[PDB]
């Protein structure tokens, strides 16, 4: 307790995507590193660029170790994501705030029993408008998905006026909302 690091429920892996049109989507997706304590998380977060500062076309992904941040993964292919669409004014006011809140929801296991349904989260930095999402394992788990959505929206501080949607990765890889909150 005087000397022991604070362990997390899960080990997490941070990934970085930079578009290179000469490579497959997968090959542009690279591991930064992994951590399984609070201290190790802050050691990583504190040395890397804020999302608002990345080049357009870059992503961060934070996924539970053993889950690859792509829809092909066993634990992603039946799932989907809660999506936050930002405009260009929100890159300034909201992007980095929202992303850090998202990471804290993951590492802290903020969704009670349904934190097990969380796979990971991704921030897309794009000229057109940034996106943040939380991916869950099974689009058919209505209680899990719906509980995660509610608590996420609460944690982000989004007003009742703003409505966010959840889309199955099947639909996206083929977009309609299975749920909104």
């Amino acid at each position: 307790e005087h000397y022991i690091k604070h362990p997390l429920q899960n080990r997490w892996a941070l990934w970085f995507f930079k578009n290179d049109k000469s490579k497959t989507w997968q090959a542009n997706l690279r591991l930064i590193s992994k951590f399984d304590t609070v201290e190790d998380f802050w050691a990583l977060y504190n040395h890397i660029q804020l999302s608002s500062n990345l080049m357009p076309g870059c992503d961060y992904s934070l996924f539970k170790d053993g889950i690859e941040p792509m829809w092909e993964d066993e634990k992603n292919k039946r799932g989907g994501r809660w999506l936050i669409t930002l405009n260009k004014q929100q890159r300034r006011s909201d992007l980095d705030r929202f992303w850090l809140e998202t990471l804290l929801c993951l590492i802290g296991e903020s969704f009670d029993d349904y934190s097990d349904d969380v796979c990971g989260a991704v921030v897309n930095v794009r000229a057109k408008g940034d996106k943040i999402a939380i991916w869950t394992t099974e689009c058919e788990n209505r209680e899990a998905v719906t509980h995660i959505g509610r608590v996420y929206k609460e944690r982000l501080g989004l007003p009742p006026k703003i409505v966010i949607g959840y889309q199955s990765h099947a639909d996206t890889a083929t977009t309609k909302n299975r749920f909104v909150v």
Binding site: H6, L8, W42, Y45, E101, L104, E109, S110
Partner: peptide, 14 residues
């Protein structure tokens, strides 16, 4: 099951 408050996690950042 290991859960952490936002407040605790923020306190650790430095």
């Amino acid at each position: 099951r290991i859960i952490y408050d936002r407040k605790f996690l923020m306190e650790c950042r430095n």
